[PDB]
Amino acid sequence: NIKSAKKRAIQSEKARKHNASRRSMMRTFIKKVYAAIEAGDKAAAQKAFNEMQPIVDRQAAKGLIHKNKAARHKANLTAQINKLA
Amino acid sequence: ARYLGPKLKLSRREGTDLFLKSGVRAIDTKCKIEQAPGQHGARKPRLSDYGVQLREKQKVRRIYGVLERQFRNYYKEAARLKGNTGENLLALLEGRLDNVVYRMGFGATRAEARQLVSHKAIMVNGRVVNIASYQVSPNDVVSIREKAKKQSRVKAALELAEQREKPTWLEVDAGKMEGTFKRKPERSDLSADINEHLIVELYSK
Amino acid sequence: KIRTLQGRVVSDKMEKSIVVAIERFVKHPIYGKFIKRTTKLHVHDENNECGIGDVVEIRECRPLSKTKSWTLVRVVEKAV
Amino acid sequence: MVTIRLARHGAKKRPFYQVVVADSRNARNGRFIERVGFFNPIASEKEEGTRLDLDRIAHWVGQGATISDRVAALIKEVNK
RNA sequence: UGAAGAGUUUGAUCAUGGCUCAGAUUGAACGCUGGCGGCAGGCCUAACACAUGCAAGUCGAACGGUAACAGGAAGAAGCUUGCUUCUUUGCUGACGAGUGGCGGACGGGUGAGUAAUGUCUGGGAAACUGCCUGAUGGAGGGGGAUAACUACUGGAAACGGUAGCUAAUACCGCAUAACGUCGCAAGACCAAAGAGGGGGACCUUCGGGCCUCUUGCCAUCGGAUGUGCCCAGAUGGGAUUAGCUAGUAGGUGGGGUAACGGCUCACCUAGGCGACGAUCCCUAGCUGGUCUGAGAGGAUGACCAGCCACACUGGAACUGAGACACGGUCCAGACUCCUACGGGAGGCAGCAGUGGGGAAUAUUGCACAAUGGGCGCAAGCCUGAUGCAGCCAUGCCGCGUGUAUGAAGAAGGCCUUCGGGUUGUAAAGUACUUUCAGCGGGGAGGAAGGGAGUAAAGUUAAUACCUUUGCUCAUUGACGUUACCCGCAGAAGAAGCACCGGCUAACUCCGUGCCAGCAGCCGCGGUAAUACGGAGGGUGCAAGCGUUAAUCGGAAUUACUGGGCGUAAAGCGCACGCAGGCGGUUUGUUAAGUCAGAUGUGAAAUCCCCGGGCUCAACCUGGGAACUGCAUCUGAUACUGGCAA
């Protein structure tokens, strides 16, 4: 209304829909692995694991996995394929 | 209040003088003293218990000029010390500046002793005061100032000073208008009209 | 060292969980008389096998399920 | 956040300051971590109105926490 | 160093038992009265609604820049001529706006909600933590943008839309890849930001590269600090509240959080909880503490400190280490306001003010001096935090309003066989003093710092710079001619309020006449009232006094300390018995209860013990003890309990 930097609100409009896309690109790739898990495949679940492996990693370096989730969330999705193996 | 009224009329029904306009006069000299201060708003009889019990409480109270509060407070320091409660109280009561000066001959009247300290003519040590209560202690120095070895009121109270024994626990110097309060009071010899046991019963609930 | 707390099973049915009642001497405050003020806590057995009166050792830790913070550390004895 | 700071505890028109390590999210009169000192700006002669330690103004300033200008200038004049 | 009772039932009396008073207290109110000053406190209610003003910014040392101000230069004018005047130019001071970073998540206020995985005490384990700080290592090379700006163009404003351009410590790749992370392993995979000062040798198309320093940046592993999360125990009242529960209880496997968890789900089992009081109902922010009180206890939660919760109502999410951000956003809703009538805007439980409520609670004041807080590598700027001032006897404390002397003792009253008594040394009258107010005149101190120069004994360039050190110089004071101090006249300008029948100290004379009225209780008054009214007098307190309300005390009259039950208040009409409480006697064992010791902890504040500092005191303050307690660690075995015989 008056704020010193009420522009802060507009600035965050940018940084909330940037984040958004990066995360939802990451969520479409998790859906692509899961495809192959119901096919029994190690050849399309793994065209979607090592291909989101730099993804997942570089987005922890944008801090967008966050904190101790980001020391956890390269093991959480490792977990997946191992059941099937 | 500091009173400001008819001193000697009190004497009548006090049954004692306790230093009301001492300098030439005392009981039954140019005044009517030892009566009742009423026509028959008050006249002599057998007395009630409770009369006495209030009066004596005020006896001790009035010969220092202490208010309601103060003297009770002194009691709350006495019954906080693990020494003698009776002693302690009368010890604290004599720490008042006004009482000390009278007993260095400065003022012929108790009221006058306290009416000195008022006008700027008193001091203690190099400190100037105009406060009628102070912390008075062993090896203090009671000091008159410049323009108080000039007043003709002060000198005129040394008269009576030659006529009162003056305490032995203070040095007293009138020749340079000093004296030190070198050591603690004795009350081995002032409790001669003071029964501490009476008042401390009453104060107790 | 560690702390393990003497409870007595008194309700075992459910799989992998034993209900224990722990009786400690609580004193009254104003009237200074000790009493049994029993207090259930929900202990997780590794495999349920208990019942009633089984002195056990429990200890404080992380939860594993809701209303947990307790484990079985040893069965002192049994009485089922 | 915690900082070395001064902290009035004087009454009205009495500047008695106490050097505290205290919070900036509570206050200088609010939540203390600890005392560490006393200071007179008026340089009173009362019993221990100046203290400033050696041991905690050499340990919480180890992991960082800054002092004040009078203090800075006092380190030298107690020749610590 | 530690606690006392009195009056009041009755013709009289002794018990029993209620009633009342004397105490201490308050964010208190009221009535009357009102000299000063120091210290503290001051909307408790309608968390009702609010005009306005202020309370939330700052870095140019990341930027692209130049809107204003002022110079520098530049051409020029006037030749208003070597001095005035005009245009140009980001060059330089300096800075509008706009991009970028950090604060606005704090501080402040309020107690409405709230019987609480909320608070308090005591532990615990599976976590986070920007600002902070240690260590080691790094900061390589590219790209795409877009604000401002610009040209248009829409609205009354709010507030827009086109089209074009561009910067970065902004954005996104790419490279490099551990003491990294993930992965049993084999392996796989991920980072960036520079900006400043200065400079000798060189180079430059002369902007700079080179070099040296400095701050900032990136990573990895720690530490600090601060913060999530769990548990146990203590936390209010009502059974004219007895039955409760479906992510309910639990188990698998999924998913989610920073992390542990039905936090959430799919499936599976059908459990779980309850009278040691569930469920429900009433009421309440909680704590250190506070008040009172001999203590125990009860009551209580004002200022001050900590915790928690809330910000028009309701709901919701974003960025981030941090927010559901009081003065951020959005949505819905009721309010409220404006309008160009198309449409918009707003939320004082922030400060100061406003109106309404209420018994009652203050000024839209001054200021960055000082203390602290924020931004910034600095300078510097910002602050209803704060320091001050103001208003209010709301309270605590100090001092004063004069001292002396003065009698037949003055009139003037009042009472009086009318001898006088009382007011009364009181006055008059005499000297003696000017505190404090008032007037005139000085005036300490609260200031350390930063700023201009100089020394380096660092670092490098040997010099710079930067930081460091002392010195040198001009100064930093809002309060306010401050504390205080000197002089100046002149008792001058400075007392009131209640009460006097008994509890309870303190009466006479009149007027009134169970009327008037009085009254905490017991009770007063029927025409000779120590109780009503006036006067006179007397009494207690005193710049206050008295009244009320309110809480504890007395009241051991709810009683653990510390109570009764034949008849005073109280024993079920009488048995049986489940839960509960309780257990003869001897031995062995255990050590849970219990006893001992040890160790943490028991916030600051507060009490006390000892002890100081303000002209005293109020007030300020140091150190010790207390911190009764709790958990933990180790022993003891008499008693209590368990077990065994």
From Swiss-Prot, chain A:
It comes from the Bacteria. GO terms for cellular component: cytoplasm; cytosol; cytosolic small ribosomal subunit; small ribosomal subunit. The keyword Transferase does not apply. One of its GO terms (molecular function) is structural constituent of ribosome. Residues 1-24 are annotated as: Disordered. GO terms for biological process: cytoplasmic translation; ribosomal small subunit assembly. Keywords: Ribonucleoprotein, Ribosomal protein, RNA-binding, rRNA-binding. InterPro entries: Ribosomal_bS20, Ribosomal_bS20_sf. SUPFAM superfamilies: Ribosomal protein S20 (SSF46992). The keyword RNA-binding applies. Belongs to the bacterial ribosomal protein bS20 family. Part of the 30S ribosomal subunit. Binds directly to 16S ribosomal RNA. This is Small ribosomal subunit protein bS20. The gene is rpsT.
UniProtKB/Swiss-Prot annotation, chain B:
Residues 95-155 form the S4 RNA-binding domain. Keywords: Antibiotic resistance, Repressor, Ribonucleoprotein, Ribosomal protein, Ribosome biogenesis, RNA-binding, rRNA-binding, Transcription, Transcription antitermination, Transcription regulation, Transcription termination, Translation regulation. InterPro entries: Ribosomal_uS4, Ribosomal_uS4_bac-type, Ribosomal_uS4_CS, Ribosomal_uS4_N, S4_RNA-bd, S4_RNA-bd_sf. Signal peptide: none annotated. The keyword Nucleus does not apply. Gene3D superfamilies: Ribosomal Protein S4 Delta 41, Chain A, domain 1, RNA-binding S4 domain. One of its GO terms (molecular function) is structural constituent of ribosome. One of two assembly initiator proteins for the 30S subunit, it binds directly to 16S rRNA where it nucleates assembly of the body of the 30S subunit. Belongs to the universal ribosomal protein uS4 family. Part of the 30S ribosomal subunit. Contacts protein S5. With proteins S3 and S5 encircles the mRNA as it enters the ribosome, which may play a role in mRNA helicase processivity. Some nascent polypeptide chains are able to cross-link to this protein in situ. The rRNA transcription and antitermination complex (rrnTAC) consists of RNAP, NusA, NusB, NusE (rpsJ), NusG, SubB, ribosomal protein S4, DNA and precursor rRNA; S4 is more flexible than other subunits. HAMAP family: Ribosomal_uS4_B. This is Small ribosomal subunit protein uS4.
UniProtKB/Swiss-Prot annotation, chain C:
GO terms for biological process: cytoplasmic translation; response to antibiotic; ribosomal small subunit assembly. Belongs to the universal ribosomal protein uS17 family. Keywords: Antibiotic resistance, Ribonucleoprotein, Ribosomal protein, RNA-binding, rRNA-binding. GO terms for molecular function: rRNA binding; small ribosomal subunit rRNA binding; structural constituent of ribosome; zinc ion binding. Part of the 30S ribosomal subunit. Signal peptide: none annotated. SUPFAM superfamilies: Nucleic acid-binding proteins (SSF50249). Pfam families: Ribosomal_S17. Transmembrane segments: none annotated. InterPro entries: NA-bd_OB-fold, Ribosomal_uS17, Ribosomal_uS17_bact/chlr, Ribosomal_uS17_CS. The strain missing both S17 and L29 grows very slowly and has a rather unstable temperature-sensitive phenotype. This is Small ribosomal subunit protein uS17. One of its GO terms (cellular component) is cytosolic small ribosomal subunit. Changing S65F: Prevents 30S subunit assembly at 42 degrees Celsius. PROSITE patterns: RIBOSOMAL_S17. One of the primary rRNA binding proteins, it binds specifically to the 5'-end of 16S ribosomal RNA. Also plays a role in translational accuracy; neamine-resistant ribosomes show reduced neamine-induced misreading in vitro. The gene is rpsQ.
From Swiss-Prot, chain D:
Keywords: Endonuclease, Hydrolase, Nuclease, Ribonucleoprotein, Ribosomal protein. Induction: Part of the rpsP-rimM-trmD-rplS operon. Coiled coil: none annotated. One of its GO terms (cellular component) is small ribosomal subunit. It comes from the Bacteria. It holds the Pfam family Ribosomal_S16. The keyword Phosphoprotein does not apply. InterPro entries: Ribosomal_bS16 (IPR000307), Ribosomal_bS16_CS (IPR020592), Ribosomal_bS16_dom_sf (IPR023803). PROSITE patterns: RIBOSOMAL_S16. GO terms for biological process: cytoplasmic translation; ribosomal small subunit assembly. Disulfide bonds: none annotated. GO terms for molecular function: DNA endonuclease activity; four-way junction DNA binding; structural constituent of ribosome. In addition to being a ribosomal protein, S16 also has a cation-dependent endonuclease activity. In-frame fusions with the ribosome maturation factor rimM suppress mutations in the latter (probably due to increased rimM expression) and are found in translationally active 70S ribosomes. Belongs to the bacterial ribosomal protein bS16 family. Part of the 30S ribosomal subunit. This is Small ribosomal subunit protein bS16. The lineage of its organism: Bacteria, Pseudomonadati, Pseudomonadota, Gammaproteobacteria, Enterobacterales.
